[PDB]
Design a protein around this nucleic acid. Structure first.
Lengths: 117, 92, 61
DNA sequence: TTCATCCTACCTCTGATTGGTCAAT
DNA sequence: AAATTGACCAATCAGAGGTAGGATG
């Protein structure tokens, strides 16, 4: 189903936590009075990442705006998924190995195979 | 192109990470750098797919619809569905 | 390393491998590590700035 | 023709970058 | 004992945002 990625590879309580976060995101994304200027990530840097690829010619203002939101969500859910492993190892510090472990739980993250060996 | 421009700024990435964790949590430098690389690849991965479809259709501009289509194509169906109403409201 | 990965992602993963290799060469990146800092001027500022006894930049009133 | 919105270049104004010490591990 | 390393502080400057003028669809 269209939401399978939300819980994919997660166990027990973690499923509820990620599901509830997504619900929160979806509710926000439905809000009627968005400020399309204010984001945690700078639009110009998103555009620059996009423009690093010479195949990309022109870019609608729509695209960095969607990425601004999408990337926020991506960082948040991956961080929440990774924290599970830090807690499992009774650690207070999130390590790279926690991110690698999180990535291994869902094939949605297969695109990062070379980024995080 | 400047080499740092292939990535989103690390401080912004780390700040989003900090908000996703308990207040007592710490984040290794390597974890911030890793996350930075992951989220930047996410943009480039989806963009490349959108770009190639744009080129095939002889359109020069990548738009919001192109991003959403690439997202579902690449197995990010949840991201595409969640951002659908966001795009439509932006457009009105 | 597996032969089969996410079927929706595989072809784009291969295309991105080529693009990343080309970009690394474009940017003249050879070592497998980042610089200690990005900007000489920002390094200099951080080196020059007054600190407290605990190494922190002085608090602003 | 008029409308929408891209590009680049230029201008404001600024917020991400940054390291010595302490403390946790 | 010794080594490792992440939070802490905020001012300067690389750069984000805004947009005029031109172009495109």
């Amino acid at each position: 189903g269209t939401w399978a990625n939300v819980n994919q590879g997660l166990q027990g309580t973690a499923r509820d936590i990620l599901t509830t976060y997504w619900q929160h995101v979806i509710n926000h994304l439905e809000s009627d009075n968005h400020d399309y200027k204010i984001h945690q990530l700078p639009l110009a840097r998103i555009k620059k990442v996009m423009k690093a690829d010479p195949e990309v010619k022109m870019i609608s203002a729509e695209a960095p705006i969607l990425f601004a939101k999408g990337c926020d969500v991506f960082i948040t859910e991956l961080t929440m998924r990774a924290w599970i492993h830090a807690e499992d190892n009774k650690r207070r510090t999130l390590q790279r190995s926690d991110i690698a472990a999180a990535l291994s739980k869902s094939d949605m993250f297969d695109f990062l195979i070379d980024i995080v060996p | 192109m400047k080499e740092q421009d292939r990535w989103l700024p690390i401080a912004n990435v780390a700040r989003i990470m900090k908000l996703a964790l308990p207040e007592n949590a710490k984040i290794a430098k390597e974890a911030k750098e890793c996350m930075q690389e992951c989220v930047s690849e996410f943009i480039s991965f989806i963009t490349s797919e959108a770009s190639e479809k744009c080129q095939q259709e002889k359109r020069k501009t990548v738009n919001g619809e192109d991003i959403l289509f690439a997202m579902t194509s690449l197995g990010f169906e949840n991201y595409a569905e969640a951002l659908k109403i966001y795009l439509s409201k932006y457009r009105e | 390393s597996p032969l089969y990965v996410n079927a929706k992602q595989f072809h784009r993963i291969l295309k991105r491998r080529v693009a990343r290799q080309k970009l690394e060469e474009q940017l003249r990146l050879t070592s497998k590590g980042r610089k200690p800092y990005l900007h000489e001027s920002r390094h200099n500022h951080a080196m020059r700035r007054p600190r407290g006894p605990g190494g922190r930049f002085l608090t602003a009133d």
